[PDB]
Write a protein that binds this ligand. Structure first.
Ligand SMILES: *[C@@H]1O[C@H](CO)[C@@H](O[C@@H]2O[C@H](CO)[C@@H](O[C@@H]3O[C@H](CO[C@H]4O[C@H](CO)[C@@H](O)[C@H](O[C@H]5O[C@H](CO)[C@@H](O)[C@H](O)[C@@H]5O[C@H]5O[C@H](CO)[C@@H](O)[C@H](O)[C@@H]5O)[C@@H]4O)[C@@H](O)[C@H](O[C@H]4O[C@H](CO)[C@@H](O)[C@H](O)[C@@H]4O[C@H]4O[C@H](CO)[C@@H](O)[C@H](O)[C@@H]4O)[C@@H]3O)[C@H](O)[C@H]2NC(C)=O)[C@H](O)[C@H]1NC(C)=O
Ligand code: XHH
Ligand code: CA
Ligand code: CL
Ligand code: K
Ligand code: NA
Ligand code: ZN
Length: 802
């Protein structure tokens, strides 16, 4: 109940919200049906429109007007945005040359430059170039400020997940808004776009920017606008808030536009009807900037122009129907559209089986436009699993397609021509970023980056300490003129042991077998003391950031950090020059495994466990194919270089090591490779402790990895070889799921040259994703600045075209 018989007199767009049943006068009251009776009349004036005209100049203040052209309007802070232009001979902000803003030029009483976040729904990244003729204000922001060619949204590329990621720095799995539609089994409640439940605070985790600001004594403008409040009135409200006295004036403001997304759904991303919505967004930007100039704030405010996701062409006829795959289509609930989430219709139904649902949806049709996954098997780069709100069964839908349960669902819900929600690597889902202001750089282009990074930067801009989040603070320092955040490398927690030769061959009973001079004896010894280490370990050894017991092991061709707890390397490092040659495993060595005389039998794997385990085989981290000499090849068969691998996965791994590593070394002028195992049994994206491991090689304590990673580094200037690089680095990485079958690749019964690289590209990763998953910190010793290394660690190689 609201006693809607209070009044909004002097309260229009009040900054603190009042508690029911007192009536509300804030920018959200409409959405709760709780505005006072007189809100429309007092707070939403429209008389005479939004612009001054010649004849309105110097008028007598008429308080009924939407905005004013009278003499006192400036000191009142309520002129139409074009007042100085029409009535004072001033130019529009867009018609002024840009001039570097070296320092904030702010009115007395401002303690920090304000921040205005201008967010645009469905603003696809290519609109910046393709709509540039009809967006002169936006284009001036872009070319004068700091801009990226595009910004990567989070998955799913829906509106609420992305806006809340912008506000918090968190993946949807951590903030809790994991789609536009959700069921939470603990609350037994549902969350929907339409309606009441979405206003309940228990949906919204982490700490959004407005709460971070408030807690630290920075005042925030209310960020959200009821849909019926027109854009002109939102701008005028922000500009009025900017005229408040110093003790009441917010320091951060948000404007939100429902366009161009609204029209993109109806007409497709490039429908000829899309020109008008883009013109209108630009007109609104122009109104803001003209209004800031009038208040002498246009060289004082930092403005962020940011999208939530792009838009793709999608029509009704590109719909796959689960009823064409499943016989039991009625025993399931599907969350449909550009992603699929499947659960049982009834938890009382004990004959529902996710296993058989997945199998019935797997590679069933020659051009099938979606792929089913258990959520823990989704590419780790999506960070889309660790939430009770995310259903165990997920469908990744091809760009341009929809998935629905039954055909009745589509024609009884062609309406739409655009949609979004797909994999966040898809070009059409990319969105925009432009920063303009004293704290941003002047005329600077920065590389594409992920929207999870912006919360830290907005905190920096406001002098706030960010709540814990998924950004990597410092990775966007290159956007900023000042206010940079100077991070330190994390401290190593465990230092390694460097074992020498301590065991005789005969002490090992591992059931392993192998068919195996003063000039060359001095050689082997030096190699084992780390003589070639500067060749194979180019950026220092990775730091171990948790408490554990491990050994550094040196060899001619590679170096490893061997874990006595997990019985295998945490990491193996080697360099393959452009000239390197691929050999094969000689026949006498096909099944050779050799004890490592530096490592006790008790901390070694054993061959017997593999013989016994009919499901599990083994592979090697440093590949025998890339040995530098027949003598060095024996090192590759050490029991300490061995890892557990399903035969189905060995097909993948063998092709990567035999063909692809050499291919990248040719193409990139040498590569440094670091590979290792990952254990993430609870799919939280974080290194498992040993008591979290759910699977072991049968009869033994050898833990089975959930994934294998590799980080492949070279010189960005590929005229210099990877091992002699004078400047910036270039990286690509991956985190391959370690699976007992290749069901994920529909073409797997073909030659590895037809499917393996495609699989690896799907599982592309950031070095930072590998760091969370292993508790290691890479690139500890380079000649580059730490900020630059942080940027490199957040890089994702996406394999999309331009
Ligand atoms: C992305 O960045 C984020 C932010 O840094 C990272 O997530 C953090 O990870 C931390 C490490 O795992 C985690 O720490 C835990 O916090 C527990 C306290 O949790 C509450 O308090 C915080 C702080 O205010 C709050 O943010 C939390 O909010 C969560 O929960 C509610 C709903 O339940 C949501 O509204 C909200 O969205 C958020 O949900 C998300 O996080 C939880 C995990 O906490 C997930 O389960 C959800 O799916 C969702 O993703 C909470 O209200 C604390 O209790 C934990 O302590 C246990 O573990 C420690 C280890 O030190 C152990 O020593 C203790 O004994 C204790 O164990 C006890 O509980 C166990 C479980 O019941 C039990 O088995 C034991 O026997 C013990 O009884 C733990 O320290 C932190 O909460 C989150 N923060 C957020 C915001 O998500 C994230 O890791 C990053 N991702 C990547 C890939 O890097
Ligand atoms: Cl239909 C619809 C959908 C969303 C909105 C919003 C809306 C606007 N800004 C938001 O966050 C800002 C965080 C800082 O960075 C910029 C975005 C949020 C997040 C809470 C989800 C929602 N206002 N009106 C709406 N109407
Ligand atoms: Ca884990
Ligand atoms: Cl959704
Ligand atoms: K076996
Ligand atoms: Na297959
Ligand atoms: Zn939309």
């Amino acid at each position: 109940w609201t006693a809607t018989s209070g009044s909004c007199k002097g309260r229009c767009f009040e900054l603190q919200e009042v508690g029911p049943p007192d009536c509300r006068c804030d920018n959200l009251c409409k959405s709760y049906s709780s505005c006072c009776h007189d809100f429309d009349e007092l707070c939403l004036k429209t008389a005479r429109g939004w612009e001054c005209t010649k004849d309105r100049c110097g008028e007598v203040r008429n308080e009924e007007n939407a905005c004013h052209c009278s003499e006192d309007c400036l000191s009142r802070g309520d002129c139409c945005t074009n007042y100085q232009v029409v009535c004072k001979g001033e130019s529009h902000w867009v018609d002024d040359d840009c001039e570097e803003i070296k320092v904030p030029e702010c009115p007395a009483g401002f303690v920090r430059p304000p921040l205005i976040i201008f967010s645009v729904d469905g603003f696809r990244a290519s609109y910046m170039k393709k709509g540039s003729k009809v967006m002169p204000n936006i284009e001036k922001l872009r070319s004068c400020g700091t801009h990226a060619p595009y910004m990567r949204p989070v998955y799913p590329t829906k509106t609420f997940p992305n806006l809340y990621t912008l506000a918090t720095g968190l993946y949807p799995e951590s903030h809790g808004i994991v789609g536009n539609s959700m069921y939470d089994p603990v609350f037994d409640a549902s969350f929907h776009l339409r309606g009441r439940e979405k206003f309940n605070h228990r949906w919204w985790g982490g700490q959004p920017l407005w709460i971070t600001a408030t807690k630290q004594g920075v005042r925030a403008g209310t960020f959200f606008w009821s849909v019926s409040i027109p854009h002109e009135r939102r701008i005028l409200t922000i500009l009025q808030w900017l005229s408040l006295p110093d003790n009441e004036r917010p320091s951060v403001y948000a404007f939100y536009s429902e366009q161009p997304d609204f029209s993109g759904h109806k007409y497709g991303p490039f429908g000829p009807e899309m020109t008008n919505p883009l013109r209108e967004i630009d007109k609104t930007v122009g109104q803001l900037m003209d209004g800031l100039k009038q208040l002498r704030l246009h060289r004082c405010v930092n403005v962020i122009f940011v999208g939530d996701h792009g838009m793709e062409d999608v029509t009704c006829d590109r719909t796959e129907f689960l009823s064409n795959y499943l016989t039991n289509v009625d025993d399931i609930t599907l969350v449909p559209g550009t992603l699929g989430r499947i659960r049982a219709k009834s938890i009382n139904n004990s004959k529902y089986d996710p296993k058989t649902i997945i199998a019935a949806l797997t590679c069933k049709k020659p051009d099938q436009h979606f792929k089913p996954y258990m959520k823990q098997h989704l590419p780790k780069r999506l960070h889309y699993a660790n939430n009770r709100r995310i259903e165990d069964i997920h469908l990744l839908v091809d760009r341009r397609w929809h998935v629905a349960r039954k055909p009745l669902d589509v024609y009884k819900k062609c309406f739409f021509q655009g949609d979004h929600g797909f994999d966040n690597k898809v070009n059409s889902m990319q969105t925009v970023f432009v920063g303009y202001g004293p704290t941003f750089k002047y005329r600077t282009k920065v590389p594409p980056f992920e929207n999870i990074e912006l919360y830290n930067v907005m905190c920096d801009l406001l002098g706030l300490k960010p709540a814990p989040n998924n950004g990597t603070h410092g990775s966007l320092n290159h956007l900023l003129r000042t206010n940079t955040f100077r991070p330190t490398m994390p401290d190593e927690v465990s230092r390694p042991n460097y074992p020498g030769i301590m065991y005789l061959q005969s002490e090992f009973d591992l059931g392993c077998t192998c068919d195996d001079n003063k000039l060359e004896e001095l050689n082997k010894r030096l190699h084992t003391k780390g003589s070639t280490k500067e060749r194979h370990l180019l950026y220092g050894r990775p730091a171990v950031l948790y408490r554990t017991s491990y050994d550094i092991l040196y060899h001619t061709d590679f170096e490893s950090g061997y874990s006595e707890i997990f019985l295998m390397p945490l990491w193996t490092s080697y360099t393959i020059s452009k000239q390197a040659e691929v050999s094969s495993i000689p026949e006498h060595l096909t099944n050779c495994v050799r004890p490592d005389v530096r490592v006790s039998p008790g901390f070694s794997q054993n061959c017997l466990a593999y013989k016994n385990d009919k499901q599990m085989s083994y592979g090697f981290l440093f590949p025998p194919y890339l040995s530098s000499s027949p003598e060095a090849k024996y090192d590759a068969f050490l029991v300490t270089n061995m890892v557990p691998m399903y035969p189905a996965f060995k097909r993948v791994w063998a092709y990567f090591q035999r063909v692809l590593v050499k291919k990248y070394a040719s193409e990139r002028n040498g590569v440094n490779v670091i590979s290792g195992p990952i254990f993430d049994y609870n799919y939280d994206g974080l290194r498992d402790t040993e008591d979290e491991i759910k699977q072991y090689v049968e009869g033994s304590s050898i833990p089975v990895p959930t994934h294998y990673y590799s980080i492949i580094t070279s010189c960005l200037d590929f005229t210099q070889p990877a091992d002699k690089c004078d400047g910036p680095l270039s990286v690509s990485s991956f985190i391959l799921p370690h699976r007992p079958d290749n069901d994920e690749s529909c073409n797997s019964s073909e030659d590895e040259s037809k499917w393996v690289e495609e699989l690896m590209k799907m599982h592309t990763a950031r070095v930072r994703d590998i760091e969370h998953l292993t508790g290691l910190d890479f690139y500890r010793k380079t000649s580059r600045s730490y900020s630059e290394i942080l940027t490199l660690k957040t890089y994702l190689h996406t394999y999309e075209s331009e």
